[PDB]
Amino acid sequence: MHISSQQHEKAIKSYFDEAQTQGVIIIKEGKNLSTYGNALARANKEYVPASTFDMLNALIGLENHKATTNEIFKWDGKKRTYPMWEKDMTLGEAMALSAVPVYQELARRTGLELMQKEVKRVNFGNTNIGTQVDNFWLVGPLKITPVQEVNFADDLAHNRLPFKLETQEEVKKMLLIKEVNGSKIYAKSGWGMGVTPQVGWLTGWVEQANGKKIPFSLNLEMKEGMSGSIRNEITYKSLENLGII
Numbered sequence: 001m002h003i004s005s006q007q008h009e010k011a012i013k014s015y016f017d018e019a020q021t022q023g024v025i026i027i028k029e030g031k032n033l034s035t036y037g038n039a040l041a042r043a044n045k046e047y048v049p050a051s052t053f054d055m056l057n058a059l060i061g062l063e064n065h066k067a068t069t070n071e072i073f074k075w076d077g078k079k080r081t082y083p084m085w086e087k088d089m090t091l092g093e094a095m096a097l098s099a100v101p102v103y104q105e106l107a108r109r110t111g112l113e114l115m116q117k118e119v120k121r122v123n124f125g126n127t128n129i130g131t132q133v134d135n136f137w138l139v140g141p142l143k144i145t146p147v148q149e150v151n152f153a154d155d156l157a158h159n160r161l162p163f164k165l166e167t168q169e170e171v172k173k174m175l176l177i178k179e180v181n182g183s184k185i186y187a188k189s190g191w192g193m194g195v196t197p198q199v200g201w202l203t204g205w206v207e208q209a210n211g212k213k214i215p216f217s218l219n220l221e222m223k224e225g226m227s228g229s230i231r232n233e234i235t236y237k238s239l240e241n242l243g244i245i
């Protein structure tokens, strides 16, 4: 409104301070990138993308006819880390649930060789997937910075990735997670491996009523007993503080 930028900066740093974590949220208006939060130097450090990769995994699988958007991925009946994953689902349902096994099956369909060259073509992060086609986004060697992630989301939001328009639209329909007063929030979460603390992500964009698109990438540390929805909460408060929703 008439709120000073010092106050915006302080308000958003306090959302990270209150959660007792260290993180950054990067916003992009048109060409301009702004870095908020309580740990601004995270912006150009490299982290595994974790499930945020699901977005590119989907783009690639669909572009290369490894799946369709109505196709059902059967649960094989093995006990899963979460009961919510013990069901048959579409890619899109799997995006909302972040169903690692489905994205792993998709990655195996695509294959190491095809995955490696698609990730080069797209030049995502450090572009390196190593030798294990089914976990390189979760344990490395693939890594990416928060700046690169918000630029990725900015590409996909404006259909600039090197995939057909219809492939991009298909994956964007999968990413709708919230509606707030005429604004829509498209995004995918990520949560890295290992003992606490782990990396957390929420990367996407808001599509405003007038058609304007404002990409964001939140990146922070997931501390002992933090709920996943803290990523969402910090993100929503930040976007609201800045009047983007």
Ligand SMILES: Cc1onc(-c2ccccc2)c1C(=O)N[C@H](C=O)[C@@H]1N[C@@H](C(=O)O)C(C)(C)S1
Binding pocket: 049, 050, 051, 052, 097, 098, 100, 135, 138, 139, 189, 190, 191, 192, 193, 194, 228
């Ligand atoms: C955490 C997490 O910690 N370790 C792995 C992993 C799994 C298999 C092999 C190697 C590592 C993992 C994971 O699965 N992360 C996923 C992607 O970010 C899923 N997104 C989460 C979410 O979005 O909230 C889920 C907590 C829903 S899981």
